[PDB]
Design a protein around this nucleic acid. Structure first.
Ligand SMILES: CN[C@@H]1[C@@H](O)[C@@H](O[C@@H]2[C@@H](O)[C@H](O[C@H]3O[C@H](CN)CC[C@H]3N)[C@@H](N)C[C@H]2N)OC[C@]1(C)O
Ligand SMILES: CN[C@@H]1[C@@H](O)[C@@H](O[C@@H]2[C@@H](O)[C@H](O[C@H]3O[C@H](CN)CC[C@H]3N)[C@@H](N)C[C@H]2N)OC[C@]1(C)O
Ligand SMILES: CN[C@@H]1[C@@H](O)[C@@H](O[C@@H]2[C@@H](O)[C@H](O[C@H]3O[C@H](CN)CC[C@H]3N)[C@@H](N)C[C@H]2N)OC[C@]1(C)O
Ligand SMILES: [Mg+2]
Ligand SMILES: [Mg+2]
Ligand SMILES: [Mg+2]
Ligand SMILES: [Mg+2]
Ligand SMILES: [Mg+2]
Ligand SMILES: [Mg+2]
Ligand SMILES: [Mg+2]
Ligand SMILES: [Mg+2]
Ligand SMILES: [Mg+2]
Ligand SMILES: [Mg+2]
Ligand SMILES: [Mg+2]
Ligand SMILES: [Mg+2]
Ligand SMILES: [Mg+2]
Ligand SMILES: [Mg+2]
Ligand SMILES: [Mg+2]
Ligand SMILES: [Mg+2]
Ligand SMILES: [Mg+2]
Ligand SMILES: [Mg+2]
Ligand SMILES: [Mg+2]
Ligand SMILES: [Mg+2]
Ligand SMILES: [Mg+2]
Ligand SMILES: [Mg+2]
Ligand SMILES: [Mg+2]
Ligand SMILES: [Mg+2]
Ligand SMILES: [Mg+2]
Ligand SMILES: [Mg+2]
Ligand SMILES: [Mg+2]
Ligand SMILES: [Mg+2]
Ligand SMILES: [Mg+2]
Ligand SMILES: [Mg+2]
Ligand SMILES: [Mg+2]
Ligand SMILES: [Mg+2]
Ligand SMILES: [Mg+2]
Ligand SMILES: [Mg+2]
Ligand SMILES: [Mg+2]
Ligand SMILES: [Mg+2]
Ligand SMILES: [Mg+2]
Ligand SMILES: [Mg+2]
Ligand SMILES: [Mg+2]
Ligand SMILES: [Mg+2]
Ligand SMILES: [Mg+2]
Ligand SMILES: [Mg+2]
Ligand SMILES: [Mg+2]
Ligand SMILES: [Mg+2]
Ligand SMILES: [Mg+2]
Ligand SMILES: [Mg+2]
Ligand SMILES: [Mg+2]
Ligand SMILES: [Mg+2]
Ligand SMILES: [Mg+2]
Ligand SMILES: [Mg+2]
Ligand SMILES: [Mg+2]
Ligand SMILES: [Mg+2]
Ligand SMILES: [Mg+2]
Ligand SMILES: [Mg+2]
Ligand SMILES: [Mg+2]
Ligand SMILES: [Mg+2]
Ligand SMILES: [Mg+2]
Lengths: 169, 212, 296, 159, 58
RNA sequence: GGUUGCGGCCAUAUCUACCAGAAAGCACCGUUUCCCGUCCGAUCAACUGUAGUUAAGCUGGUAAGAGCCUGACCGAGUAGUGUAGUGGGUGACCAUACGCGAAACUCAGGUGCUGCAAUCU
RNA sequence: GAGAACAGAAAUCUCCAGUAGAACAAAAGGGUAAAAGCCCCCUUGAUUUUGAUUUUCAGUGUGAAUACAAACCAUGAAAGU
RNA sequence: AAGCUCGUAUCAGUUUUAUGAGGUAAAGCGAAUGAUUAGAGGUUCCGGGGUCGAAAUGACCUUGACCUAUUCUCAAACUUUAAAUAUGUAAGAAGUCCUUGUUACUUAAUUGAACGUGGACAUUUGAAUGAAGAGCUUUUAGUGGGCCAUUUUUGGUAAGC
């Protein structure tokens, strides 16, 4: 049947990819600090593209992964700004999805000119329960087909709760 | 600017091809190994006549070209440029070297690549040709003509088989009018009696009658 | 799986499968080697490992040696034996680890003959020591802690099995710094925190801080300590007497059975599918070949 | 220049095996060797410590010593017109007990049991090994087996 | 100059005159190389059993 | 017989797709006070065996499946090769004599066996 | 490969597949997957004393390595290395 | 050359029996790496063109790239497999087995490990053939330009190279 297959939201990952380091970076990760409440993590540039103004290991972007009800909060608060409208793209065929928004302020952050404005990549990862088989140390293993998170199967969960829209075909 | 074909005729030295340690080698004078109507379906041309090497020797690319050209140039202008299919059955991957130039200290003779040649066996096929049995004599004399471009003895033999397939005419006509042979390009594919029964039947729906 | 997935003939053909017990993720061989293998000058002297394995809420302590024919078990004491010693709940806990590692310590020491010798620390104040050398008499039984795949974390509960197996009198070399009460910030152990843990004083201190600040949860968990009414402060003396029971009778009463292998054989053989004959296979196939042909 | 290094020329010889790579199974370490055990040497490339020289690869020897990870193996190496004894220090991963011995033991022990049973039965023991003897007389029956007449076959092509 | 660089020619001929002599086995090989721990004790395990065959012989 | 913990050999055990799985054991699962670890109690630590489920992990079965393994009236006594001749041939090369003898391939059978200890309608 | 604002073939974020198709100063060849690779933490065994061995070989020297003994140490819960 | 100690005790440019190692020949490329002829069939946030257009995350023809299942040809520095010839060790008295001393090494443990005392078994005492025996030491000559045949084989068009 379907007793122990839910669709939980595993984690939500906010991502601010900003093409430089230094001050403007710390202001972009000060943003994510007050949204998540957790202290967030920074990403070094893989190589030097020189037309993106990035050097190898220059600490370009920032992100944070959030789990539990703190996600559904920020998912909804971000799903607001999308007018509860997503696309058929935005959904991986592995059962997860994500969107993006300019103006982090468009969810209740005030403005605070000493900080500034940044757009965010929102990414929401889904799995059913029992997916720690693929995570735990001992006896790791991949979860069978019936229980896997698919695309057609997550959209059917995404319209059901939240009432929102898939929209493109 | 080429050394006479005598010097490189015999198979004396180890096969030494273009390689990560060669790199320096010229372009083969033969390029195009299939001629005539080369999409022609397996049943279109039954007849096959090979050119067979009777020696253990070396054919140069530039000979392979000149015989290819020669034979085809005839075979088309008698029975027509769609009448047959000419498959050069050997490739020249062996790099020939030349040491270009009393004296003194100190000689070293390793060659820079002078050309390429196909190492052939005794009874190894140079040319294969398929046409309809109607066109036999034209093909044969066409191979008999390219013969003169090759050093040393070679022979032409009517194939026991059906075109370029691996089946004899009767054994092929067996699997053909039984449901077992399906067209692919110029060649064919065959019904496996092992593997997934599902797409075994997706392919060869002609089969699964068990009749003509 | 997927379409652009689905490994080829090649990939399979050339694949090299690991060991079964690495494929099942149960055995880290790079460690197993370095544990089991014996000094070649000590010949057939067996190397004896103490295997400590937590299931979900049960504990295993096995003293094992090794053969090319497979490993051999000296003796084992599981936590789920702990009721006969008067522990009916929290058998997955640090103080049960200690309890189980001390049962396994005496049990083996019992069956060997070193039982009256090498009694370990009987007072169990939780001070840091390892069982010493009897002068003019056999050396203690030396057994090595096999942690399995357990992450080694200071205060983790595999090292409860340790402390109890050491305090049982077995020789199990080890250091302190993985014992709860080891200060990160200094070289110090505070064995008072370790004695509390040995007796469950971190679990008993939980019930108290629970009973008055949440009774909804306290319904849920400790529910057995209600229905049997063993309250928070009563815990330390549950264990304190459990050791008494332990060193009293280690002897391993086996289960009473109730039925037999033949019975368990038949009742289980009910449920397994027997393999098809090739004749049976030639049937279904020839049956499918009749089916799908002839306009399906 | 010419090159001869310690592993010079060991390319395929010390090559691991097919599908047999990766850390070695435990019974290799579980074996016991005492002095005077007759061992085969084959180097296992994945274990670089205590590894034999390419020469001794395939050479059988007698262990003269037992240390922590290693058996000392004593092997007689011909140099010039004589043999020289050489003492190899080999890690267990390259050493293998040799079966050349066992069949001779499984014979000796057989001869004692053959002998005692024979003698206490009586004389007539035959315990030396005779090599393969000529065939004894026989009559092959024609019955339902009638000689099949074959002939050499003509020339054909089928290319 | 330019004179021949190397050969093994004839060299087995000379080798076989006096003939590739077999290694010459003994009982009681020397302990050379044997571990010092084993040997040091084994000294007393031998010195020890020599006294025991003196007293016992009386 | 089933399952677990420790294994040996390391695919007849791995791969894909399905179906079935009583009992027990596993498991997934609940919690965050305590030792402890993370950006994130996801992993790791800890407490509860309580609140739930065989959904998945696990085990079995299915398939002219892939792979793997085994055999041989397969390829084939073929290729290669030790030995011989004042054999053949302008040669290239080839037969013959006394021996050894493959490979991919073709067909067929098969799809983990088992050591210790515990436990189980 | 399927995904995510500016973001483009290349920035950062995610899941799936992945027997090594990578990495290990350099030549090449071997070897390695809960590693031998990547990150981290702790360190100085790149230390002490004298012998045995293996390669090259005359069985000399040199270079290089291997396995012990006697110390003093490092790391780790520990076997160990 | 000198002998020296011994005398069927060992001895062997050989076979056989048992058991090792090897990666050449061959083979293979609808197996890995690499090279290579030809078609056939799939595919797209999408390589270039063209056509309908006021734009397609348009629709079509096109040509590329890709992907699948096939096809001709290949390797000294490629390979799953893998010969022949050659090559290691064994075929007993220094053997096999029983009892149980020594020890400072080793084990939880007289447990081991090594060396033994004492004890049972010697007609074929443990394959074939051969042996003008076997073992052993000192001392010194000439030599240290080589060349040839068949087979394997490198450079060279080749050479009485
Ligand atoms: C049997 N082998 C033959 C061998 O017999 C020989 O043939 C000669 C051929 O060379 C002679 O002819 C040639 O040589 C003559 C000098 N001897 C001068 C004339 C010229 N045609 C013929 N007159 C006789 C054949 N049997 O040379 C050719 C060959 C194939 O090698
Ligand atoms: C040297 N030329 C070729 C040589 O390359 C090889 O050719 C094979 C040929 O025997 C195979 O053919 C064979 O193998 C099939 C696959 N198992 C099945 C049966 C048969 N068709 C072809 N599949 C591939 C060619 N390269 O063997 C044949 C040949 C003529 O000697
Ligand atoms: C009888 N032993 C085997 C016999 O079982 C059979 O072996 C094949 C084996 O050659 C195939 O595999 C072989 O060929 C592949 C290339 N086509 C590469 C891998 C190689 N082991 C295996 N996949 C199936 C066995 N039955 O054919 C070869 C053999 C040696 O005769
Ligand atoms: Mg995995
Ligand atoms: Mg030749
Ligand atoms: Mg040749
Ligand atoms: Mg040459
Ligand atoms: Mg050849
Ligand atoms: Mg012409
Ligand atoms: Mg000059
Ligand atoms: Mg010159
Ligand atoms: Mg000609
Ligand atoms: Mg002629
Ligand atoms: Mg580890
Ligand atoms: Mg410490
Ligand atoms: Mg060189
Ligand atoms: Mg090998
Ligand atoms: Mg390899
Ligand atoms: Mg591996
Ligand atoms: Mg390894
Ligand atoms: Mg080293
Ligand atoms: Mg006999
Ligand atoms: Mg000269
Ligand atoms: Mg000279
Ligand atoms: Mg020179
Ligand atoms: Mg149940
Ligand atoms: Mg949880
Ligand atoms: Mg945990
Ligand atoms: Mg199910
Ligand atoms: Mg299964
Ligand atoms: Mg199959
Ligand atoms: Mg076999
Ligand atoms: Mg046979
Ligand atoms: Mg056979
Ligand atoms: Mg031949
Ligand atoms: Mg021959
Ligand atoms: Mg001859
Ligand atoms: Mg003749
Ligand atoms: Mg013949
Ligand atoms: Mg023959
Ligand atoms: Mg199977
Ligand atoms: Mg993975
Ligand atoms: Mg590899
Ligand atoms: Mg890995
Ligand atoms: Mg792995
Ligand atoms: Mg030294
Ligand atoms: Mg040296
Ligand atoms: Mg022989
Ligand atoms: Mg070859
Ligand atoms: Mg092959
Ligand atoms: Mg290939
Ligand atoms: Mg080769
Ligand atoms: Mg042999
Ligand atoms: Mg004899
Ligand atoms: Mg003599
Ligand atoms: Mg002299
Ligand atoms: Mg002189
Ligand atoms: Mg001189
Ligand atoms: Mg001269
Ligand atoms: Mg001449």
């Amino acid at each position: 049947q379907n007793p122990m297959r839910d669709l939980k939201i595993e984690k939500l990952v906010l991502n601010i990819s900003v093409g430089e380091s230094g001050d403007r970076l710390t202001r972009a990760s000060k943003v994510l600090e007050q949204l998540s409440g957790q202290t967030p993590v920074q990403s070094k540039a893989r190589y030097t593209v020189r037309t993106f103004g990035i050097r190898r290991n220059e600490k370009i972007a920032v992100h944070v992964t959030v789990r539990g009800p703190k996600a559904e909060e920020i998912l909804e608060r971000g799903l607001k700004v999308k007018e509860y409208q997503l696309r058929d793209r935005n959904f991986s065929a592995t059962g997860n999805f994500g969107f993006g928004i300019d103006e982090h302020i468009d969810l209740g952050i005030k403005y605070d000119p000493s900080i500034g404005i940044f757009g965010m990549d929102f990414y929401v990862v889904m799995n059913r329960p029992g997916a720690r088989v693929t995570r735990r140390k001992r006896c790791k293993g991949t979860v069978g087909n019936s229980h896997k998170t698919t695309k057609e199967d997550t959209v059917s969960w995404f319209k059901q709760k939240y009432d929102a829209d898939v929209l493109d075909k | 600017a080429r050394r006479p074909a005598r010097c490189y005729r015999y198979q004396k030295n180890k096969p030494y091809p273009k390689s990560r340690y060669n790199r320096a080698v010229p372009d083969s004078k033969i390029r195009i190994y299939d001629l005539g109507k080369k999409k022609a379906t397996v049943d279109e041309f039954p007849l096959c006549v090979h050119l067979v090497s009777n020696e253990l020797e070396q054919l140069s690319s530039e000979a392979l070209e000149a015989a290819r050209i020669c034979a085809n140039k005839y075979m088309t202008t008698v029975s027509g440029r769609d009448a047959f299919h000419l498959r050069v059955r050997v490739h020249p991957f062996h790099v020939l070297r030349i040491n270009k130039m009393l004296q003194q200290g100190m000689r070293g003779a390793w060659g820079k690549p002078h050309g390429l040649a196909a190492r052939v066996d005794i009874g190894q096929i140079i040319f294969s040709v398929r046409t309809k049995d109607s066109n036999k004599d034209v093909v044969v004399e066409g191979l008999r003509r390219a013969r003169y471009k090759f050093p040393g003895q070679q022979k032409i033999i009517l194939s026991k088989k059906w075109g370029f397939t691996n089946l004899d005419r009767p054994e092929y006509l067996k699997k053909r009018e039984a449901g077992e042979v399906k067209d692919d390009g110029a060649f064919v594919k065959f019904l496996s009696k092992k593997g997934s029964l599902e797409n075994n039947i997706r392919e060869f729906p002609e089969y699964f009658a068990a009749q003509a | 799986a997927f379409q652009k997935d689905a490994k080829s003939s090649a990939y399979s053909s050339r694949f090299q499968t690991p060991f079964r017990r690495r494929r099942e993720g149960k055995t880290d061989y790079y460690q197993r080697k370095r544990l089991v293998t014996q000094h070649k000058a000590k010949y057939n002297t067996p190397k004896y490992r103490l295997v400590v394995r937590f299931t979900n809420k049960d504990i295993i302590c096995q003293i094992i040696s090794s053969t090319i024919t497979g490993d051999v078990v000296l003796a084992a004491a599981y936590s789920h034996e702990l009721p006969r010693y008067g522990i009916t709940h929290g058998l997955t806990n640090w103080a049960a680890a200690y309890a189980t590692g001390l049962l396994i310590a005496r049990r083996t020491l019992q069956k060997l003959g070193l039982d009256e010798t090498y009694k370990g620390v009987e007072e169990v104040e939780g001070e840091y020591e390892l069982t010493e050398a009897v002068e003019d008499g056999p050396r203690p039984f030396k057994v090595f802690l096999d942690i399995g795949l357990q992450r080694t974390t200071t205060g983790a509960r595999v090292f409860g099995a340790l402390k109890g197996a050491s305090d049982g009198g077995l020789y199990v070399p080890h250091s302190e710094n993985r014992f709860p009460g080891w200060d990160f910030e200094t070289e110090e152990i505070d064995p008072e925190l370790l004695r509390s843990y040995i007796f469950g004083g971190h679990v008993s201190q939980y019930m108290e801080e629970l009973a008055d600040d949440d009774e909804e949860r306290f319904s849920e968990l400790f529910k057995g300590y209600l229905a049997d009414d063993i309250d928070a402060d009563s815990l330390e003396d549950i264990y304190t007497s459990a050791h008494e029971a332990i060193r009293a009778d280690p002897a391993f009463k086996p289960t009473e059975k109730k039925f037999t292998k033949e019975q368990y054989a038949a009742e289980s053989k009910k449920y397994r599918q027997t393999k098809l004959s090739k004749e049976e296979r030639a049937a279904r196939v020839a049956a499918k070949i009749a089916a799908l042909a002839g306009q399906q | 220049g010419k090159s001869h290094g310690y592993r010079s020329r060991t390319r395929y010889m010390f090559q691991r095996d097919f599908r047999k790579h990766g850390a070695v199974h435990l019974s290799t370490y579980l074996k016991v060797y005492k002095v005077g055990d007759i061992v085969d040497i084959k180097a296992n490339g994945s274990i670089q410590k205590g590894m034999p020289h390419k020469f001794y690869q395939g050479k059988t020897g007698v262990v003269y010593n037992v240390t922590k990870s290693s058996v000392g193996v004593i092997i007689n190496k011909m140099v010039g017109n004589r043999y020289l004894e050489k003492r190899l220090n080999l890690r267990v991963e390259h050493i293998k007990h040799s079966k050349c011995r066992q069949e001779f033991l499984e014979r000796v022990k057989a001869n004692a049991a053959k002998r005692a049973e024979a003698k206490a039965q009586g004389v007539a023991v035959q315990l030396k090994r005779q090599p393969a003897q000529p065939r004894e007389s026989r009559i092959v029956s024609t019955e339902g087996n009638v000689p099949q007449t074959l002939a050499p076959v003509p020339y054909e092509t089928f290319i | 100059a330019k004179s021949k660089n190397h050969t093994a020619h004839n060299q087995t001929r000379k080798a076989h005159r006096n003939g590739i002599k077999k290694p010459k086995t003994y009982k009681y090989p020397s302990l050379k190389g044997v571990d010092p721990k084993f040997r040091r004790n084994h000294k007393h395990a031998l010195h020890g059993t020599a006294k025991a065959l003196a007293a016992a012989k009386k």
